[PDB]
Amino acid sequence: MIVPVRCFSCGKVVGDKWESYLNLLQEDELDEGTALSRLGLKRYCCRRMILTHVDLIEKFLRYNP
Amino acid sequence: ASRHGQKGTIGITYRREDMPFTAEGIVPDLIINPHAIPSRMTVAHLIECLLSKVAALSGNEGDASPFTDITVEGISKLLREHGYQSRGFEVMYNGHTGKKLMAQIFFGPTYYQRLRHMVDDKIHARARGPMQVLTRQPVEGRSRDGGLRFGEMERDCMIAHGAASFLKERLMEASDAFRVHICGICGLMTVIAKLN
Amino acid sequence: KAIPKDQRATTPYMTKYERARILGTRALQISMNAPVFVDLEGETDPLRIAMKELAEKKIPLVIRRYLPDGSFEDWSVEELIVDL
Amino acid sequence: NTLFDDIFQVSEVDPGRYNKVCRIEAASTTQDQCKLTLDINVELFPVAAQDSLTVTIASSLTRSWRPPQAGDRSLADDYDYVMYGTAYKFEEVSKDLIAVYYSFGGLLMRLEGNYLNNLKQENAYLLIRR
Amino acid sequence: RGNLMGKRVDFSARTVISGDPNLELDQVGVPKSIAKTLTYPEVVTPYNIDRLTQLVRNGPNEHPGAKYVIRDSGDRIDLRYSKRAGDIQLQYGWKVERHIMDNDPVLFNRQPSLHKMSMMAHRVKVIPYSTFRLNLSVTSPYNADFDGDEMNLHVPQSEETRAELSQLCAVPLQIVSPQSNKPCMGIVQDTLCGIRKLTLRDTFIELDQVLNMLYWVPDWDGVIPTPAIIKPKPLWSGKQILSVAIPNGIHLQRFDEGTTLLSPKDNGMLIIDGQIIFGVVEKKTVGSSNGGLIHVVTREKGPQVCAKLFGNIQKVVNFWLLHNGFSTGIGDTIADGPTMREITETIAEAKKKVLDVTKEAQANLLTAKHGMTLRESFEDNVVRFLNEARDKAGRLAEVNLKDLNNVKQMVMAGSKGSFINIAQMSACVGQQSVEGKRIAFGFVDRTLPHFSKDDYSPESKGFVENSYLRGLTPQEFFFHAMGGREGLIDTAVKTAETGYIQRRLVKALEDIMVHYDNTTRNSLGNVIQFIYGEDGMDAAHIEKQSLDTIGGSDAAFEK
Amino acid sequence: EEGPQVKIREASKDNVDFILSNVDLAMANSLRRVMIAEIPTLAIDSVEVETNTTVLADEFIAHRLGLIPLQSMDIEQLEYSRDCFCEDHCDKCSVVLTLQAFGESESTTNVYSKDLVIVSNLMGRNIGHPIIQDKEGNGVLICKLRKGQELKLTCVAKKGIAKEHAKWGPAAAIEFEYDPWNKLKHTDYWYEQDSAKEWPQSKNCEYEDPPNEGDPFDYKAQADTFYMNVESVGSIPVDQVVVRGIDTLQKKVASILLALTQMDQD
Amino acid sequence: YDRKVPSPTGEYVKEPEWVLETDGVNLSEVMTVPGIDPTRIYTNSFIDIMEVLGIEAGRAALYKEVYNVIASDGSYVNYRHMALLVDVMTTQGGLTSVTRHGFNRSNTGALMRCSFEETVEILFEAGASAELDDCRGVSENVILGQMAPIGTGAFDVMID
Amino acid sequence: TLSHLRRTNTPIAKPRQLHNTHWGLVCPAETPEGQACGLVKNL
Amino acid sequence: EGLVEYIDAEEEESILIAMQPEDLEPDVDPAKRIRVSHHATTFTHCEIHPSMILGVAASIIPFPDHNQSPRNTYQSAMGKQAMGVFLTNYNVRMDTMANILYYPQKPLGTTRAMEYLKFRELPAGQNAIVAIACYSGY
Amino acid sequence: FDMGGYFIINGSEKVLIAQERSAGNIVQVFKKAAPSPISHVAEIRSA
Amino acid sequence: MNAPDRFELFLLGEGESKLKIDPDTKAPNAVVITFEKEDHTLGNLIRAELLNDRKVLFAAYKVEHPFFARFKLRIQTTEGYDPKDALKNACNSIINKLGALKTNFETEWNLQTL
Amino acid sequence: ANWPLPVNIRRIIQNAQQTFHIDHTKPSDLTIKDIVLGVKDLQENLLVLRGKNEIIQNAQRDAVTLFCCLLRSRLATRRVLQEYRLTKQAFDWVLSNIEAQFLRSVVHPGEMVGVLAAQSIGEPATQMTKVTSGVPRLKEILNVAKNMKTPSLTVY
DNA sequence: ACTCTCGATG
RNA sequence: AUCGAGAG
Ligand SMILES: Nc1ncnc2c1ncn2[C@@H]1O[C@H](COP(=O)(O)CP(=O)(O)OP(=O)(O)O)[C@@H](O)[C@H]1O
Ligand SMILES: [Mg+2]
Ligand SMILES: [Mg+2]
Ligand SMILES: [Zn+2]
Ligand SMILES: [Zn+2]
Ligand SMILES: [Zn+2]
Known part of the structure; x- marks a missing residue:
């Protein structure tokens, strides 16, 4: 669907870090690890929360209704 | 269930305070019992946990393909390079008391899937409901507010116990109990009982 | 025909099924506001009252034990031994 | 009062797959017919090889165990390592050799002697010093 | 068979089951909705008129309440639609169908109902959430885990039938089973492993934790036990605080291997007067064994005391285990380097032996055993060699394991897992087999197209040198898949044919019982056994005792 | 002051890394629990x-x-x-x-x-x-x-309250570690060969003295020094997270005390 | 085979003997062979035991085989159960099977036998022969919905 | 869906056993259990 | 271009297949698995990749070669019962009943075969921070 | 992502499960049982 | 469906009192106090602070079931010492230590940067 | 020697040398007549059948033969006086307790033991995984196989 | 020759 | 009513 607002495990806000993450992958041409590290995602649960997520809403918006 | 034939329902839900926690403050989303490991021999579950942990930390995608030369030793070394116990263990603290735990816990990310079998779709209870027309017995089905079949094996169990009155209750009052008239001569249900 | 009160071969002890049947019957009687032959002493549960009533042998029932031939031996609850 | 008093010489120490308790083997330096086997919490009171430990068996110093308050109370020990157990077997090797078996919460003990006032009683305080 | 021998009934329920450490053995966790649904008719008496009036005042939707009210005329009052649901003068003799409440006798059941312990009477404890909660130690007779299992619950409708349930079908009354003259229930899983971890001689417990565990026992006398250690620090052993759970007058004696009243390995078991003297408590003791602790407590103190014993032991051990913790990782499946080397060289010399036997057989020097083919002898030899290889490497891996090894700990406690599990996970999973024989030639003179024809080598006929830790090769994987496949097949077949056999047996011995003369007969009066069991004893009250007059020398007998 | 002590090692808008000194284990744990759940x-x-x-x-x-x-x-x-x-x-x-x-x-x-x-x-x-x-x-x-x-x-x-729903959680992850050298022996370490070389070394080890092999086991020692790191989400500043945590614990103790005061009524 | 044998001094001592196992069965001519002990010879076929040594030996062999099957898995069942089964199989005079060919041909109740396997045909032949049902069978009272003579109902309760 | 669209049904000596010739054509693991085990296969 | 052939079982009967392409070439790591050296030469075909012996449901299993086969079968059965996104157009379809996972996640440990099964695009489960431990006993 | 390969009958998606059969026009010899009068049978299913 | 309300973990129900003081019938001069709508957070702390008092013989808390937010606390003190006073002293001690901790943290926080 | 019998005599004895706290250094206040005639008269009470004719009595003695053998084996004069060192009170208590437990161990009339047996054999057959053994062999036995799969002859 | 749960089509 | 899939 869309990026989860907060991390399940601990509770850190990660919903505001999605777009930025994408930028850090395409604009600065970094790898996923360093991008996740720069966003302040040290714990691997939040790091998971962003890395593991799939943005499906973009495919959902492809319909006209 | 996990991805290795390790199914199971939820026993209880604990809040983050009651949950055990590592020194980093990381709390498990899920707790499974170790006894579901040696008898079933699902090593690939553990290896999945290790690989997923390393891939999580490094931010890469762990390759869990069948026939490859990826070994538990390499994954262990990679995990140690990130500053953790190479075997996935982590020193955790009891959530209730705050005191450490003696044995360290195999702790890490594992891909779990939610199966279609939920309790509120299974739960059922009937106390005197709709009956059938042909046999005058409780209808069949949860969706039809039906009763449960007291099978032959159940009857056998109640016989083994010796509870005769209970067996009579299940087979009369609990199900279909009918009063009929019998002729004292031929002994058939020919009787035209004009009551009142 | 019948079987005399003497020369009775059946077990002098009360079987668990006889106990369950007697306690069940008595509790069934108490459950329909029937006179209690013992001191309640706080007890209100008909089963428990029937149990205390059995412990004092204040139950006016009798067991007709059937033999496979057709014979039958009668054993009053007051006479039967309850070792269970 | 007191039931037994002697000085033993530790002949062997054996950590049988443990890390807090070791089985000790000693003998009396007075009687040439007296020996002792005893499970010892090394983590509390370390017992190396070739040591001369002073061993005492008492019956007192039932009621609930009050914490040592204050004290300001008769400890009746001033030892180093004190335990409390229960005798469960009186083995008679010979007429001149009588052995006893104590159980200190699992930490067993076999004392072989000759001349005893050790009856099958819950009272079994084991006091070791130096 | 479908409408007379067995038919659908009212006052029944069914739900997914779950385990609950804080429930008693003879209890059942019943969801609130089911409690409001299922009902029991209770006649208005001077003893309960107030309570029943309060229940009717609550009505449905609120537990505890009532569904219907039956009057003298026989008319039924619906307490959810009637206008007079608020004001009701309960007359003596009226029936009140109230919600199921606590300590109510219900029948807990799980299909397939193979034996009588599949239907047992439990005490109701109304609880939230939508699951049938049951004690752990009641898992064994029902044969039930919690990976989606569902159980049924039936409710009695009169005093006599609930008397039948409470006085005959009660769970404590079913602890010692007449099936194998032994207890069919015991301590399992966490409570088992834990009780092995607690009774170790290295396990000492300080003041606070001891106080907590002590208070955790409902049958506690409130008397603090004098610590096994006084100075320099007051400490209690696991055995010492566990002794509180065991009732007084309980004596248990069992010698294992080198149990010499001093037991250097802390094996065996001696418990004097409800106080464990020595030995590690595990499956042989607190399990469902013949002369186990449960059997003794049941036969001595009684069934109630034994169920409460289950409760106490579970509470204490689960508490200690909760604050001690126990796990299992891949590290518990990794033997040492040189150990794996000796394993590999063991498989190597095994394959070498098989190679030599093969070459010998091909040289027509193989002399067939009397009564079998040359080829059958060859097969037998090779199979035996590979099996010996798996067992050898497995025993090596087992020896290499430490006492801190979690898997080995669970094996020691008897909680779960065995030797072959360690053998296959850490060393070598061994030879795969189908229909008794090793992997046959599906293709012409070969098992797979990746092999040449007439290749009777171990790796060709389905030998797996690799362990689950190392990983299986494609061939090994496929062969193992064949084996497992046959496993599932014959499993389904087995449960089917057994399913039939059970019914046949039941219908055959259906009308057989003991009459009032200890004569086992049927509905025809035909004597099957003149004295039941040829002795007239109930199988429940029978224990394996030694006849020490049949053994020993004549001189020893005389002496 | 006179009782328990605090030593702020690191401090920022989102995190506070400090050392709780002279405190019982249960109080530190309870403080953690309150900081997690019981803060409005x-x-x-x-x-x-x-x-x-x-x-x-x-x-x-x-x-x-x-x-x-x-x-x-x-x-x-x-x-x-x-x-x-x-x-x-x-x-x-x-x-x-x-x-x-x-x-x-x-x-x-x-x-x-x-x-x-x-x-x-x-x-x-x-x-x-x-x-x-x-x-x-x-x-x-x-x-x-x-x-x-x-x-x-x-x-x-x-x-x-976060006790009612995790959305009301003022803090995220609270780091918590006492005795980095296992000198209290509250943990029996798992190993295959060497226990020290396998298990990583904590940062907090820099703030305590390593044990001597010549020294026996200190059996009369308790837990005094705790190392904590409290992280806030943003709703409440870190200092105010831990402070309102303390005040919440204190208040809900004072409610029990008040209850004791009230139960003296006839 | 290994074997426990009473030593002349008293105790039981392991005395190993040679035993001939065999694929193939013909008890009626092997036991009469000069050279072997004709009192200890045994076959896994309780049929031949029942035919040669009698119905009692067939009973013992049947129980031996059933018990062997139960204990082969490593389990254990009390004697009286298997003994009851074997007895009920051997009391008719021969070896009564646990199928529709065996005990279902007995002279019991019509309803009882109808409640297993061949249902309708049993009722037919019972209706043609005009049989009398004693109604003291379990399944019969189960059908009639009456309190069967089972445990609790194995007697009567009156008042004195 | 993917699994259901690539399924194999078989009516009616040992058709349930995973045969050697099933290598590379039929999945060795993916099959129902309890009843139609071995009969129902997947490509 | 005559680089790949279509072989059925009957023709498979008369060929010699190489498991890996490295089996055509003429001190080790004790960690890896013991693989038998190629004692055959006259190859005619070579396997594309052994992992292609599995189906769609089995290809989702991580390290299936490290599992007991019936467990792989069980997971192959239960994978069809997991929830997630079955289709992108689930909101414009009127199915009898459908279940869609709130926050789907592509597994941290995947298979090379998952790429073609579109599993990382349409996952069926979440990466849960799991802990193997005996806690409260629940 | 929809792969197709299914039909739509009355709005319901239908899948034709592949049916496994024995190949025709193939010659196969089979050994018969012991009580059987015939020992071997060479048969072929013509299509 | 059958899940209880969340606020039942901290909100007292109809008629449910906060504390339930019961005379312990086991050992003399003992008491069992039922704490409603509270968990380990309070229980462990109070119990740990009741062991500091050297005039207290016994002190232990337990949560009989995780489903319900409540716990029992058993206290046994020496003769001539009412256990309620031990509970009060423990509570006040806790409050004082917490207040001092708050003051200390504040003073330490006022000396930081960033 | 190890065989399933009613009444655990060992537990009764070890309960006797615990309830009365007898010391192993004190003469027993018993007599040869006490022990011998006591035990001999104890067997008279261990009743399974209660008829007054010869047949039922023979069936009785035949039914309690083994348990009486065990009884004599454990309650021998030498064994009672030297191994246990019981007193008069303790011995009488042991006797009464043995009689009681034996009377408890008797099967209750009405016990549907046919079904109990069928289940006691059927249920463990469900937990079952060179001659034919296991479930197929059980099926052969129950069906009374005209032609069993592995006919064997064990010749001594 | 065991209990359940859904769907489909007449 | 039948059939199909699935749960222990
Ligand atoms: N046709 C049938 N008849 C009766 N029961 C059946 C059945 N099909 C399945 N079951 C039940 O389903 C259960 C399957 O559970 P499994 O998980 O296969 C046992 P396990 O995992 O091997 O044992 P474990 O829990 O000891 O590790 C069986 O125990 C059986 O009772
Ligand atoms: Mg299980
Ligand atoms: Mg299950
Ligand atoms: Zn997180
Ligand atoms: Zn008529
Ligand atoms: Zn307002």
């Missing part, structure tokens, strides 16, 4: 949806709306809706903020937390404002709209 926070509890033509479901949106971090500074001079003598909610108990989004451009129109507009009267209290730690200043990405998709709704935020 303002978060969305009611969602009234007027029009919703977006991809996401209604309660799907309402959920993440509930998880939006809101300003909870003056939350102590706000009141529980269950305690206020008003019908449903008011300005003394709840904070109402609207959300009106609509697809305008051909490109995807994102709906963030900055689009939330406070409607109710705050009357001075610093409250209700959605925390935006975002660099661009957008905040939590709530939804996405296509071309003609509209999302119009209203949010009533109420005072709540």
